[PDB]
Amino acid sequence: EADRTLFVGNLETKVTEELLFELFHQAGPVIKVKIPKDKDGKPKQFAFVNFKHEVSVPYAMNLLNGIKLYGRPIKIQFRS
Amino acid sequence: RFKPGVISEELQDALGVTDKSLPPFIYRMRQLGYPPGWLK
Ligand SMILES: [Br-]
Ligand SMILES: [Br-]
Ligand SMILES: [Br-]
Ligand SMILES: [Br-]
Ligand SMILES: [Cl-]
Ligand SMILES: [Sm+3]
Ligand SMILES: [Sm+3]
Ligand SMILES: [Sm+3]
């Protein structure tokens, strides 16, 4: 459930689900990364990361919050 | 098997890492400990 998910914001426009998958894979096994779309099909500037293990969520916050992707620090928030 | 800090060229460039330089998050990983989700 939400126990295993993180919100990642402040994404530079070139950040993709693939790139975020690889980065957060360093914190623990990742199931999927979702960058949502608007009604017109445009990608948003934030993502949801779904981990395999809840324990990876607090660790990923400490490991990766503020890390710069294409010069912009990602902003991680808990969802639960 | 999990390989900490082994990342693709696309991710290196995204992180601003030049050749033979540690990814920025590795400096944190070394103090935080081994990622619990990869413990085996
Ligand atoms: Br994408
Ligand atoms: Br949404
Ligand atoms: Br949320
Ligand atoms: Br290491
Ligand atoms: Cl997508
Ligand atoms: Sm559960
Ligand atoms: Sm729980
Ligand atoms: Sm690709």
Residue numbers in the entry:
A (entry chain A): 7 to 86
B (entry chain B): 285 to 324
Paper text:
In the nucleoplasm, however, hMTR4 binds the RBM7 and ZCCHC8 proteins, forming the metazoan-specific nuclear exosome targeting (NEXT) complex. NEXT promotes the exosomal degradation of non-coding promoter-upstream transcripts, enhancer RNAs28 and 3′-extended products of histone- and small nuclear RNA transcription. We conclude that ZCCHC8 is a scaffolding subunit that bridges the interaction between RBM7 and hMTR4. In this work, we have shown that RBM7RRM binds a proline-rich segment of ZCCHC8 at the back helical surface and is able to concomitantly bind RNA.
To obtain experimental phases, we co-crystallized the complex in the presence of heavy-atom compounds. Co-crystallization with Samarium chloride yielded a different crystal form diffracting to 2.0 Å resolution and containing a single copy of the complex in the asymmetric unit. The structure was solved by single anomalous dispersion at the Samarium edge and refined to 2.0 Å resolution with Rfree of 22.6%, R-factor of 20.2% and good stereochemistry. As the two structures are very similar, we focused on the highest-resolution atomic model, which includes residues 286–324 of ZCCH8 and residues 7–86 of RBM7. Side-chain electron density was well resolved throughout the RBM7RRM–ZCCHC8Pro interface. In the complex, RBM7RRM exposes the front β-sheet surface to solvent and engages the helical back surface in binding ZCCHC8Pro with conserved interactions. Overall, ZCCHC8Pro adopts an unusual elliptical conformation when bound to RBM7. The RBM7RRM–ZCCHC8Pro interaction is dominated by conserved hydrophobic contacts that can be grouped into two adjacent patches. The first interaction hotspot (patch 1) is in the lower half of the RRM domain: ZCCHC8Pro helix αA together with the preceding and following loops insert a set of apolar residues into a shallow hydrophobic pocket formed between the α1 and β4add elements of RBM7RRM.
